[PDB]
Amino acid sequence: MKKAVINGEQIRSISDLHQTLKKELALPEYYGENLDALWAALTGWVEYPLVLEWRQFEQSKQLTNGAESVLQVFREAKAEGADITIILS
Amino acid sequence: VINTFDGVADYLQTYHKLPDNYITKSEAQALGWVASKGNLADVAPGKSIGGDIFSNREGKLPGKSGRTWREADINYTSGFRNSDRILYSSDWLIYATTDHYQTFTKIR
Structure with a gap:
């Protein structure tokens, strides 16, 4: 049971969000830092089960609408078989 | 083994499917x-990842009513994957x- 943590109050941009994901999920060095690259990582790199804890999501949404698009990719992966548990704390 | 951008592109245009050296992530x-x-x-000796649906999430590829996309790895031989991918539409x-x-x- 792997765990990834996003401290929402430290996310200041969509680029920063991708950099954090790259670090937390130990993604490949060439990670594209975009929604398609994220989907690629969730379907071809990340190991499950995974618990994704995104603290202070409301703040990420503000510093940024890009946060919701990222969250949506995780939820889509979950709907499509990935054993992911998302905690919005 | 066909795994180059032009080699795979030509094969896709000709046979409307990926070369036999490709397998999906599933x-x-x-x-x-x-x-x-x-x-x-x-x-999976001699195989490269390929054939899965590409959703063009950033909208960079041209969209059209009914058009869908798939992707495949390019230039892969062995070891960890690289950052090269070919994208082909319906x-x-x-x-x-x-x-x-x-x-x-x-x-x-």
Whole structure:
């Protein structure tokens, strides 16, 4: 049971969000830092089960609408078989 | 083994399917592939990942009513995967990315 943590109050941009994901999920060095690259990582790199804890999501949404698009990719992966548990704390 | 941008593009335009050296991630995983282990060549000798649906989430590729996309790995031999991917549509437009889906270039 792997765990990834996003401290929402430290996310200041969509680029920063991708950099954090790259670090937390130990993604490949060439990670594209975009929604398609994220989907690629969730379907071809990340190991499950995974618990994704995104603290202070409301703040990420503000510093940024890009946060919701990222969250949506995780939820889509979950709907499509990935054993992911998302905690919005 | 056909795994170059032009080689695979030509094959796709001609046969409307990927070369026999391609397998989906679902298939690869079932065969024992674990990305973090970089063991694709160990469980599936001579194979490259390819055929899965590409959703064009950033909207960089041209969209059209009914058009869908798929992707495949390019220049892969063994070990960990790289950042090269070929993108092909249901109506056979063909694009390439060498920066892990950041930018795309039409090649057919």
